[PDB]
C-alpha cells in the first residue's frame, strides 16, 4: 500500500510538503462529524473503494458526487472532512483575510490529487455576488472556481474543484442506485447457457427495450439480466434513460452498435386575462350580434341599438387589427376597482411598526390589546387611528410561516413551512423498487396494558416500525415497554432479516440517540446500508413512515379497550373513564394482533399511491428489479452473533482463571483454558436479553461464554443489571464504608430483592417482552 503511493508520488513528482499533506489526509480521522443542520439530510454511505463509511452533509448535492467517485475508475481514494486549510483571500474592501475552511472531499486520482467542494446553484450565486474575489464562473469550461482554493492547490502540486449540482446527470444516479446491489456482490457468475440465450436474443434484435426483453420466457430472471448489464456484456446507456422505467431503454450488444443505431399574441393574452363570467358575457354579446352578422336580424331585440352597434364595431376592429374578432368582446372586469389605500401614510407606517413590534412577539398578545396600544400611540402622535377590523384584516394578511415562527416558534410554524415541488426527474422521493429506502421510527402506542400474570397495569407499549418507502409495506414491527434503545433496533432488523430476507439500502432514521450510537452505525456499516438522517424537528422527511402510525391508530389501536385516546383532553378525565382501570390487553396478544394487521390486513389493502396492495407492489417490483438472492442475509447463528452489541472498547482480556469482564460480570469458556488466548485481547459480544451468555472471538470463531452465576444470572436483561447496580451504589452510599461494585453483590441483590417497585416493574417488562420474542420465533 505504501510502495504504490510512493511510486505515485515519484511519478507525479509531488513536493515534500504536498506529500506531507497527502500522507496526513490518508492517515487521519475526519475533522468534524457531519451535523444535521436545519435543511440538509445528512448521513453516511458505505464505500467499497475506500472500504469505509463516508459522511455526506447533503444527500442530493455531495452524495451524487460521492456516488460518481465511488463508481469512478480514475479516482483512487476520496477522504471526507480533510484537515482545515487557511485560505487567504482579499475581500471587496482589500483586506487579505485568512479563513479556515474544510473541503467536502479530498480526491486522489490516478494522475492528480486535490480538494473537491460540493455546493448548489443559489449558494454559488449568493457567494459570488457577496464575494467577488472568492468565487467566479468560467464559461469556457463552464465551471465554478474559487481563487484561494485553487491558489492553495497550485502552491502544493494539487488541484481544487467545485462540484455543483447543475452538471450531475440524475439518470446516472438512478441507475447507480439500481445496480449498486449487484456492484456490492463479489462473485457474479451467470450461467453460461442463460447468458448465451440472452446474447442470442440481443444480437437477433437491436434496440430492444428492457420491458420487452424481461417478459420473454427464456428460462431466465431479472437478476440474470441485470448481472449481464453490470458486466458490460449487454450495453445500456446509464446516462439518458433510467432502468426503473424499462419501457424506454433500448438494449444493444456493445457500445459501437448502440452508437450506430442511435446515429395574435396580445389577443391570446387578452383571452388569458378573462374570467368564466367574462367569458359568459362575451358569449352573450356574440349571440346578440350573430343575427346582425348574417343578414337576418331579429324582429324582437331587447338590447338597444347603440350597444349592438358598439359590439359590431369592436368585432370589426378586432378582426381587422388583431386577427380574430371574438377577442374584441372581452370585458376583463378584474382591472376595475379602487385599490388606492384610504389611510394616511403616517397611520400606515405606525400601524406597520406596531404589528411588527407588539403583535409578532414572544407573548402571544391578543389583537384587541395591540390595537388599543396602537390607538394610544396614534393619539399621542396626532395621526388617524385605524379601526379594529382594519387591524384584524392586515394581521390576516401576514399569516403563514413567518408569523407562526415569530409568535409560537419554529415547531408550530412547520405546518405552513413549504412543499418542495419537483421540477425535473430527480431521484424519486419514495424510491424506485422494493428494499431501496426504508424508514425507521418509534412511537408510544395509545393503549394501556395489564400484567399477564398479576393483572397490574404496565403502561403504554412502544412500537417500532421499519417500513419501505416504495410499496408502503410494513417491513418489520416491534413492541416493547422500554424507551428507545438499540435493543429496539436490533430487533426490528432481526425480524426484517428473518421473515423477509435482507435489509434496506438507504435507511432514514431521525436524529435519535439510538441512531447516533456506535452500535447501530457499526451494524449498518457491516451490512452496507446507507444511513440517512432527517434534520432535527423536521418530520416530513420520514412522513411516509410517520402516517403509518396514525393508520395503526384508526384501524387497530383506537378500537381497543384502555386506549390512550381520551387522555389527549387531560382536563376531561375521570376515574370512571381512566384506561388504567379499563385495560385488559397484554403485550403478547397486542403484539400478535398488531403483526396480524400489519402483515395480512394492511398488506392486502389497496393503496391510493400504488393502485395495488403492498404485497402485490412488492412482488411486482422484485420481479422487475430482480430477486437479488446474493444480497440475502441468512437468519442463522452467525447473524445472531453479528447483531448482538458489544462494549465501547470492542475486545476484553482473558484473565487466567476468571475469563472476560463484560458489564461488571465475568464470563468463562472451555477454550479459555488454552494459554494461547490467555492474557490477550479478544473481541467480545454481549447478549442484552440474557446476561448469563456472551460470545468471544477466538481462533476465528465466535464461541459462547457462560458466567460463573448461571443459576443466578440467566434470563435477566441488562437494563435490570443497571437498575440493580445503581440501587446497590445508592444503598452502599447510605453507609460510609466504600465497598466496590462486583459480580457477587449484584448476584445477591438479584437473589435477595424481590419487592422493589422499580425492580418488579422491570422484571414484569422483561417477562412481557419474552412473550413477544416467542411470538416472533413462531410460538
Amino acid at each position: 500500500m505504501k510502495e504504490q503511493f510512493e511510486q505515485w508520488v515519484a511519478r507525479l513528482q509531488i513536493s515534500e510538503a504536498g506529500q506531507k499533506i497527502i500522507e496526513k489526509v490518508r492517515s487521519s480521522e475526519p475533522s468534524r462529524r457531519v451535523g444535521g443542520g436545519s435543511k440538509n439530510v445528512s448521513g453516511r454511505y458505505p464505500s467499497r473503494k475506500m472500504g469505509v463509511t463516508i459522511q455526506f452533509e447533503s444527500h442530493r448535492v455531495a452524495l451524487p458526487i460521492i456516488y460518481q467517485l465511488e463508481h469512478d475508475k480514475d479516482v483512487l481514494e476520496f477522504y471526507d472532512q480533510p484537515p482545515q486549510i487557511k485560505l487567504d483571500y482579499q475581500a471587496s474592501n482589500g483586506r487579505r483575510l485568512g479563513v479556515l475552511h474544510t473541503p467536502d472531499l479530498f480526491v486522489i486520482r490516478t494522475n492528480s490529487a486535490g480538494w473537491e467542494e460540493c455546493k448548489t446553484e443559489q449558494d454559488l450565486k449568493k457567494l459570488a455576488e457577496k464575494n467577488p474575489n472568492r468565487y467566479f464562473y468560467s464559461e469556457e469550461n463552464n465551471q465554478w472556481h474559487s481563487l484561494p482554493g485553487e491558489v492553495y492547490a497550485n502552491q502544493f502540486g494539487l488541484y481544487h474543484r467545485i462540484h455543483s449540482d447543475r452538471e450531475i446527470n440524475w439518470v446516472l444516479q438512478r441507475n447507480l442506485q439500481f445496480l449498486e446491489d449487484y456492484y456490492r456482490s463479489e462473485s457474479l457468475v451467470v450461467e453460461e447457457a442463460i447468458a448465451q440465450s440472452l446474447l442470442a436474443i440481443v444480437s437477433s434484435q437491436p434496440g430492444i427495450t428492457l420491458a420487452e426483453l424481461l417478459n420473454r420466457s427464456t428460462g431466465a430472471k431479472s437478476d440474470d439480466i441485470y448481472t449481464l448489464i453490470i458486466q458490460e456484456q449487454i450495453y445500456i446507456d446509464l446516462n439518458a434513460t433510467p432502468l426503473a422505467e424499462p419501457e424506454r431503454c433500448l438494449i444493444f450488444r456493445d457500445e459501437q452498435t448502440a452508437s450506430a443505431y442511435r446515429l395574435s399574441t396580445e389577443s391570446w393574452q387578452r383571452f388569458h386575462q378573462a374570467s368564466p363570467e367574462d367569458q359568459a358575457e362575451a358569449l352573450e354579446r356574440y349571440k346578440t350580434i350573430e343575427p346582425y352578422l348574417n343578414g337576418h336580424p331579429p324582429e324582437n331585440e331587447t338590447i338597444p341599438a347603440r350597444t349592438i352597434r358598439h359590439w359590431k364595431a369592436k368585432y370589426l376592429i378586432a378582426i381587422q387589427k388583431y386577427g380574430c374578432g371574438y377577442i374584441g368582446l372581452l370585458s376583463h372586469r378584474s382591472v376595475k376597482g379602487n385599490r388606492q389605500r384610504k389611510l394616511p401614510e403616517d397611520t400606515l407606517a405606525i400601524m406597520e411598526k406596531f404589528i411588527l413590534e407588539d403583535y409578532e412577539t414572544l407573548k402571544q398578545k391578543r389583537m384587541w390589546e395591540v390595537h388599543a396600544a396602537l390607538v394610544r400611540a396614534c393619539e399621542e402622535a396626532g395621526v388617524i387611528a385605524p379601526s379594529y377590523k382594519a387591524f384584524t384584516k392586515e394581521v390576516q394578511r401576514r399569516t403563514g410561516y413567518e408569523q407562526t415562527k415569530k409568535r409560537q416558534g419554529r415547531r408550530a410554524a412547520y405546518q405552513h413551512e413549504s412543499f418542495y415541488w419537483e421540477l425535473a426527474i430527480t431521484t424519486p422521493r419514495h424510491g424506485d423498487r422494493p428494499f431501496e429506502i426504508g424508514h425507521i421510527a418509534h412511537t408510544e402506542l395509545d393503549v394501556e396494558l395489564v400484567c399477564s400474570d398479576t393483572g397490574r397495569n404496565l403502561g403504554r407499549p412502544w412500537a417500532t416500525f421499519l417500513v419501505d418507502a416504495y410499496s408502503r409495506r410494513l417491513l418489520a414491527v416491534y413492541l416493547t415497554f422500554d424507551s428507545p434503545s438499540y435493543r429496539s433496533c436490533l430487533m426490528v432488523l432481526r425480524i426484517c432479516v428473518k421473515r423477509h430476507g435482507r435489509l434496506p439500502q438507504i435507511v432514514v432514521v431521525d436524529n435519535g440517540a439510538e441512531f447516533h450510537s456506535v452500535y447501530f452505525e457499526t451494524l449498518l456499516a457491516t451490512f452496507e446500508c446507507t444511513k440517512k438522517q432527517r434534520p432535527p424537528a423536521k418530520a416530513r422527511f420520514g412522513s411516509v413512515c410517520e402516517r403509518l402510525f396514525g393508520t395503526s391508530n384508526t384501524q387497530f389501536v383506537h378500537n381497543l379497550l384502555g386506549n390512550t385516546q381520551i387522555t389527549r383532553n387531560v382536563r376531561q378525565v375521570t376515574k370512571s373513564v381512566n384506561p388504567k382501570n379499563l385495560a385488559v390487553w397484554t403485550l403478547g396478544l397486542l403484539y400478535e394482533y398488531l403483526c396480524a394487521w400489519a402483515y395480512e390486513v394492511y398488506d392486502t389493502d389497496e393503496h391510493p399511491a400504488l393502485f395495488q396492495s403492498p404485497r402485490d407492489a412488492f412482488a411486482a417490483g422484485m420481479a422487475i428489479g430482480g430477486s437479488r438472492v446474493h444480497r440475502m442475509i441468512p437468519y442463522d447463528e452467525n447473524f445472531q452473533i453479528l447483531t448482538l452489541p458489544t462494549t465501547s472498547e470492542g475486545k476484553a482480556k482473558v484473565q487466567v482463571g476468571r475469563g472476560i469482564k463484560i458489564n461488571y460480570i465475568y464470563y468463562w469458556s472451555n477454550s479459555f483454558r488454552d494459554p494461547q488466548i490467555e492474557n490477550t485481547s479478544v473481541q467480545i459480544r454481549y447478549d442484552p436479553f440474557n446476561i448469563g451468555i456472551a460470545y468471544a472471538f477466538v481462533r476465528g470463531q465466535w464461541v459462547q461464554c457462560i458466567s460463573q452465576y448461571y443459576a443466578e444470572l440467566q434470563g435477566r436483561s441488562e437494563k435490570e443489571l443497571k437498575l440493580a447496580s445503581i440501587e446497590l451504589r445508592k444503598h452502599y452510599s447510605n453507609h460510609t464504608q466504600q465497598s466496590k461494585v462486583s459480580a457477587k453483590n449484584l448476584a445477591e441483590f438479584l437473589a435477595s430483592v424481590e419487592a422493589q417497585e422499580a425492580l418488579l416493574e422491570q422484571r414484569s417488562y422483561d417477562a412481557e417482552v419474552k412473550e413477544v420474542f416467542r411470538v416472533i420465533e413462531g410460538g
Binding site: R33, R48, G51, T53, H516, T522, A525
Partner: peptide, 15 residues
C-alpha cells in the same frame, strides 16, 4: 459535543 459520537471512519463489510 455532548452525547455525539466521535467522527470515526467506520469499516464496512461482513467478516
Amino acid at each position: 459535543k455532548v452525547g455525539k459520537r466521535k467522527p470515526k471512519r467506520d469499516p464496512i463489510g461482513v467478516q
